Amino acid sequence: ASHITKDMLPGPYPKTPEERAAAAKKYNMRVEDYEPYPDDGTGYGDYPKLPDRSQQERDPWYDWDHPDLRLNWGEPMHWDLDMYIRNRVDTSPTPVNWNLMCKHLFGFVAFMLFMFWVGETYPAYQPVGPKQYPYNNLYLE
Amino acid sequence: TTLDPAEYDISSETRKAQAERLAIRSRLKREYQLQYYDPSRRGVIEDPALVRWTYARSANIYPNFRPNTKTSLLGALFGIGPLVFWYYVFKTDRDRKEKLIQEGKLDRTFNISY
Amino acid sequence: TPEEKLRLQQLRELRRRWLKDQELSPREPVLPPQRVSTYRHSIFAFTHVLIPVWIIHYYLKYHVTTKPYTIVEKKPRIFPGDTILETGEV
Amino acid sequence: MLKYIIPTIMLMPLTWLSKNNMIWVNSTAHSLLISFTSLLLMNQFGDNSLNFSLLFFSDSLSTPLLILTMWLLPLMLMASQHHLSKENLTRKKLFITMLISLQLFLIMTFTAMELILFYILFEATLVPTLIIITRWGNQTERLNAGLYFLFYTLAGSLPLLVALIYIQNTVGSLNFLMLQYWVQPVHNSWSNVFMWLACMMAFMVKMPLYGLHLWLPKAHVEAPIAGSMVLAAVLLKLGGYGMLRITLILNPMTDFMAYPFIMLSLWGMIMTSSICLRQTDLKSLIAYSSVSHMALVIVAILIQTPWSYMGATALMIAHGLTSSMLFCLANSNYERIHSRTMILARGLQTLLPLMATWWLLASLTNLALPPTINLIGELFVVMSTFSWSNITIILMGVNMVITALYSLYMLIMTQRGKYTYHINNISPSFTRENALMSLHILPLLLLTLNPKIILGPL
Amino acid sequence: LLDLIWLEAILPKTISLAQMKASTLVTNQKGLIKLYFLSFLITILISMILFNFHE
Amino acid sequence: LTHQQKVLRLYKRALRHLESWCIHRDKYRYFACLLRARFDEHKNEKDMVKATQLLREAEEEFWHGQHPQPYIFPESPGGTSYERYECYKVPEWCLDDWHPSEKAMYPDYFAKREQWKKLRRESWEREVKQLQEETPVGGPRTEALPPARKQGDLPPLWWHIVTRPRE
């Protein structure tokens, strides 16, 4: 039976400094880069004061993270930003954006034109004219 | 792609009094472990971060909501959009098949099943 | 750092002491309790394989006379003509 | 039913007449004795049809359907004793009688012989289920969900009396489905469209659609004590079979307007499966699964032409055992953790290893392991609507792919480490927790041995 | 955001619409018996002209 | 984290990233003192941007070309079989409910099991006597006095003082 600030309310400018943290301590003293200003853009059905989104994100990734359990497994107290998309997702590796795989898949895009050609073994190419003579022209005798 | 993720920045001496943001959580961590360590608890912790999570997500979004913008009326381009389109596929379907089934034949003669 | 000096001295006298406690097996402490209780190769395989032979063969001899499609074994594949027939082939 | 309603009404002057705590062991004892009488006089042959006695029973000839109706009352009393024992004895016995009274109308229903006795029995429910939501439920926002549990089913069902009496005064009498031999055809008009409309739309109120189904994750979310009437609400949703009775005749030839019921139940089919991978509730987790492959059967019926009635006979009982068993899993793991939110259940699979087998085979009935009663009917839905067109396999096949993730999305949530908490949740799965968890797959794979009885006319 | 909003738009409008129109029927009837009975003669005069009531 | 110890967090991993690429042992060992001469450029100086520009150019050529699938020391935050021992997984205190003839085995172990509990059953006349005193108002990391000024028991007794051993 917790009624005092039991959820978010119609924010985000009903004295937003008195939101964090009279309750729902997402910010310490409303200057922590996590004061409840980040109502994305409102008007929609997004989050209001919402101890919620655009706080620092893209991974809880089960780090070394020893000062508490605190990464994803072992319940830090009150730091909820977003959930249900992160038990299977990660941070940035050493390479960067470069979509070389479509260029890597473009290696057969040159040979996709080679799929129109034929594959007879003998004789050799001699690609100069109609002297190759593929099929039957004349009769037996 | 997603992301760079900017794991390094500058310091020395930007915002000297910004420190002890852990003093917010270590006070809660002291309030956590004192609640965690006791000779008789026999139950879960209340943990109001999950209380304020689902109830402000499952409920209290429609009291938040207003149709004062067209980006809230933007769901017309996703719900009813393809729902006309499948019927726009399917109304062109089943009648071109029927005309070849009515006028002319194409099926095998041993099509008992079906 | 001189602060944790008294730390991890009594903890080794508690954690490893609990592990000194955890290392504990008084005279192999299984009771079990109550109660009790190679060359043959006489019935360990005979119960295993030698018994279900007769049951399933009875399930096939009593099957061909009932079902109109028994075993549907294929043709002869014979190049000459042989003694099972009367004619021969070159 | 010669004497099937007759023994079970005598069970009612036995609850408050009895002694103290003997009332549980006595009520379960008598209840299983009727189950043989159900099996015995039924399951007879069988060639069009078994008109049973008279104007009150047609013996459920084409579809048996009635054995499943009688498992549940000697199955939920062992489930409801989890958290009920805190009240006065006279108040607890009333909660026993109202569930028994729920079965008696449904015993006469599903056979019903007629149509004017159908609708009064089609509406004979919703009186005991509503009272269960009001008293002895869970926390608040019950009462609006009780109002959403009304005002839809009653809103759509009232034009049936506009429809049926309009048939009774026009062509013969709807007392007999078997005196429905003369049936005039129905042409396209601007009056006959509404005649088919009121004939159909009330049946979409119970088995849901992509529209008008917001009430369904209210009664299953805000639910009684530990899945008590929620198991009965499974049969309440699948028990809208009466479209099989009605639209088999009585304007069959109006299929020109079948398409917006085909399409809406098809893109809404693939959608509501993925509408719950970011849900945060256990009792809502099975609820949106129970929309999807229950919405599978509707395109098996409005599309006529059997090889579609074959599987649709079996797909009613498909989740009818399965989702009832999943709610038994969800009714458990709540007496030990007093919140139904799934995320708090990290660190399972080690404290309860015995029920961990039961998580495996239950969710193995959604992948469904083709020698079962689940993928034996879904192949016939494939066998029907592919003859409709070649496109229909696409959206219907992804339904077999989304619930592959959506079922194993629950199984992996059991496997975590160090559990952070829980000086409570000690109890290593007592006898009531696992004997009640049985008797679901135990008839289910049993029916997969010779699945001949699970077949319509058809 | 669509399923519990733009399906929560059309039907909870109906309860709010009736509760809007149940508010205009009682709160405008707070006594003033002079204002009651001038409206009953409006009923008895509009019945003459309007319809088949004299024919 | 401070500016001087920011050098130390890079210095260990500067050589740790290199042995991933080497093939011998001396080939890696020859480049230890060889990379040390670059570290011996500015030996001891002020703490200003002259020490930061040595690190501001350590942004490139440290992240640039960094560890193409390195050694991971498999018992680690990453690496294969890092948390593989989970069929056992040490369920400490799963042993409350037994309903005996299953508590028949280990007689002396249970006799010692209730013994340690009195250390936890009687600590809040001492631990909570200093728990209100040692924390000033709401301040930093809340370990107690590591002897607790007479006898430290534990302070973290007993879920940390009897924490989960690995196997």
From Swiss-Prot, chain B:
The keyword Electron transport applies. Accessory subunit of the mitochondrial membrane respiratory chain NADH dehydrogenase (Complex I), that is believed not to be involved in catalysis. Complex I functions in the transfer of electrons from NADH to the respiratory chain. The immediate electron acceptor for the enzyme is believed to be ubiquinone. Belongs to the complex I NDUFB4 subunit family. The modification Phosphoserine is found at S11. This is NADH dehydrogenase [ubiquinone] 1 beta subcomplex subunit 4. Complex I is composed of 45 different subunits. It is found in: Mitochondrion inner membrane.
UniProtKB/Swiss-Prot annotation, chain C:
It holds the Pfam family NDUF_B6. The chain crosses the membrane at residues 38-60. It comes from the Eukaryota. One of its GO terms (biological process) is mitochondrial electron transport, NADH to ubiquinone. InterPro entries: NADH_DH_b-subcmplx_su6 (IPR019174). The modification N6-acetyllysine is found at K20. One of its GO terms (cellular component) is mitochondrial inner membrane. Belongs to the complex I NDUFB6 subunit family. Complex I is composed of 45 different subunits. This is NADH dehydrogenase [ubiquinone] 1 beta subcomplex subunit 6. It comes from Bos taurus.
From Swiss-Prot, chain E:
It is found in: Mitochondrion inner membrane. The chain crosses the membrane at residues 31-51. Core subunit of respiratory chain NADH dehydrogenase (Complex I) which is composed of 45 different subunits. Belongs to the complex I subunit 5 family. Core subunit of the mitochondrial membrane respiratory chain NADH dehydrogenase (Complex I) which catalyzes electron transfer from NADH through the respiratory chain, using ubiquinone as an electron acceptor. Essential for the catalytic activity and assembly of complex I. This is NADH-ubiquinone oxidoreductase chain 5. The chain holds residues 552 to 606 of 606 of the full protein.
Curated annotation (Swiss-Prot), chain F:
The keyword Phosphoprotein applies. Residues 130-151 are annotated as: Disordered. It comes from the Eukaryota. Keywords: Acetylation, Electron transport, Membrane, Mitochondrion, Mitochondrion inner membrane, Phosphoprotein, Respiratory chain, Transport. It is a peripheral membrane protein. One of its GO terms (biological process) is mitochondrial electron transport, NADH to ubiquinone. Signal peptide: none annotated. The keyword Protein transport does not apply. The modification Phosphoserine is found at S76. Accessory subunit of the mitochondrial membrane respiratory chain NADH dehydrogenase (Complex I), that is believed to be not involved in catalysis. Complex I functions in the transfer of electrons from NADH to the respiratory chain. The immediate electron acceptor for the enzyme is believed to be ubiquinone. Belongs to the complex I LYR family. Mammalian complex I is composed of 45 different subunits. This is NADH dehydrogenase [ubiquinone] 1 beta subcomplex subunit 9. It comes from Bos taurus (Bovine).
